Design a protein around this ligand. Structure first.
Ligand SMILES: [Ca+2]
Ligand SMILES: [Ca+2]
Ligand SMILES: [Ca+2]
Ligand SMILES: [Ca+2]
Ligand SMILES: [Zn+2]
Length: 316
C-alpha cells in the first residue's frame, strides 16, 4: 500500500509488548517500509487461501488476542532480516531486498508453520500441542532461512540433502534467537510447544537423542517416512554444529568449541559458496572444512574443531 511510515504498538503471543513498523493510509497496515522492499503481514482468516488480506487496523494499537500472531510474525521477520543484514551482509533472502510476506491464522487448529517457496505461513496451533507458531523466534527464523537456502544452495527436500536443509534452518534459527537475546538456548520451538508442560521442545540441538533423534551417523534413519528422515537425520548435523560452537566430548571424541559467531560465519559461507542441490553429509563436511580454511587458515583451531565435530558424529 502507498502511505506514510509509522510505528504502532502491540502485544505478541507470549504477552510481551513491542513496537512494530506500520503504514498509514486510512487504516494502519502491517507493512514495514524500513527493511528492503518491505515486510508485509496478512490475515488468512482461518482459511487456506493465500496470502489472504494485508493486515489492516483502525488505530495502530495491536492488543487484541486475534492480533498477537500477526504482531510477532511481523516483528520477528524484521529481526531475522536485521540478523542477515548486520551479521552476514545479505539483503533479504534473495540478496536483493525481496519483500517478505507472511500470513497468520492459516486454517484451523493447524500445528505447523512453513515457507512455501514464496511466503511464510503460520497456523495458530490447536492450543495443546502448540500456541500460534509465530511466537517462537527460532521457528520464524528457521522457516525464513529455508528461503535463503532455496535461493543459494537449493538443497532438495529429501534424504541427506533435505536433512542438511533442515539442520541449516535449525542452526540459523538458533543463531537468530541468540542475536535477539530472547532467553536463548539450543532447543527448537520451546516458546510455542506444549503450553501445559514446562522444559521440553520439539527438537534439541545439544542433545538430539532426548527426543529420540539420531546423534551419530550410525543411528541414521534409512526408511522412507518424512521424505527419508529430513526432520530426523538433521539431528546428526545439529549435534555437529552444537559441538563446533560449544565443544564437548561425544562418543569419546573431544571437540574444542570456537563459539557461535564463527559457527555462523562458517556455515553461511558453506551454504552460499559450496553446497549444491544434492549435497550429502560427506559433502557438507568438506564444504564446512573448506569454508573454515578460507576464513581462518588450514592450520587453525577453527578447521581442527570442524573436523573433530564431524568425526564425533561419524560423518567422514
Ligand atoms: Ca487496533
Ligand atoms: Ca529460548
Ligand atoms: Ca530455542
Ligand atoms: Ca512446553
Ligand atoms: Zn524446516
Amino acid at each position: 500500500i502507498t502511505g506514510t511510515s509509522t510505528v504502532g504498538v502491540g502485544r505478541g503471543v507470549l504477552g510481551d509488548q513491542k513496537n512494530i513498523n506500520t503504514t498509514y493510509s486510512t487504516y494502519y497496515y502491517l507493512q514495514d517500509n524500513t527493511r528492503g522492499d518491505g515486510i508485509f503481514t496478512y490475515d488468512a482468516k482461518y482459511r487456506t487461501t493465500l496470502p489472504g488480506s494485508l493486515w489492516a487496523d483502525a488505530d495502530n494499537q495491536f492488543f487484541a488476542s486475534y492480533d498477537a500472531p500477526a504482531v510477532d510474525a511481523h516483528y520477528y521477520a524484521g529481526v531475522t532480516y536485521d540478523y542477515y543484514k548486520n551479521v552476514h551482509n545479505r539483503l533479504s533472502y534473495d540478496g536483493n531486498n525481496a519483500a517478505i510476506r507472511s500470513s497468520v491464522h492459516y486454517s484451523q487448529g493447524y500445528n505447523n508453520a512453513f515457507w512455501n517457496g514464496s511466503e511464510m505461513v503460520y497456523g495458530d496451533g490447536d492450543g495443546q500441542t502448540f500456541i500460534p507458531l509465530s511466537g517462537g523466534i527460532d521457528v520464524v527464523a528457521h522457516e525464513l532461512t529455508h528461503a535463503v537456502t532455496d535461493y543459494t544452495a537449493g538443497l532438495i527436500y529429501q534424504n541427506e540433502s533435505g536433512a542438511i536443509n533442515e539442520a541449516i534452518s535449525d542452526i540459523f534459527g538458533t543463531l537468530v534467537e541468540f542475536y535477539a537475546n530472547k532467553n536463548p538456548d539450543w532447543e527448537i520451538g520451546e516458546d510455542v510447544y506444549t503450553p501445559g508442560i514446562s522444559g521440553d521442545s520439539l527438537r534439541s540441538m545439544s542433545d538430539p537423542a532426548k527426543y529420540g533423534d539420531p546423534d551419530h551417523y550410525s543411528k541414521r534413519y534409512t526408511g522412507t517416512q518424512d521424505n527419508g528422515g529430513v526432520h530426523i537425520n538433521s539431528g546428526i548435523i545439529n549435534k555437529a554444529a552444537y559441538l563446533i560452537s560449544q565443544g564437548g566430548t561425544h562418543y569419546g571424541v573431544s571437540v574444542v568449541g570456537i563459539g557461535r559467531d564463527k559457527l555462523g560465519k562458517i556455515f553461511y559461507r558453506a551454504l552460499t559458496q559450496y553446497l549444491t542441490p544434492t549435497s550429502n553429509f560427506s559433502q557438507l563436511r568438506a564444504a564446512a572444512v573448506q569454508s573454515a580454511t578460507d576464513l581462518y587458515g588450514s592450520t587453525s583451531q577453527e578447521v581442527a574443531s570442524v573436523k573433530q565435530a564431524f568425526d564425533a558424529v561419524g560423518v567422514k
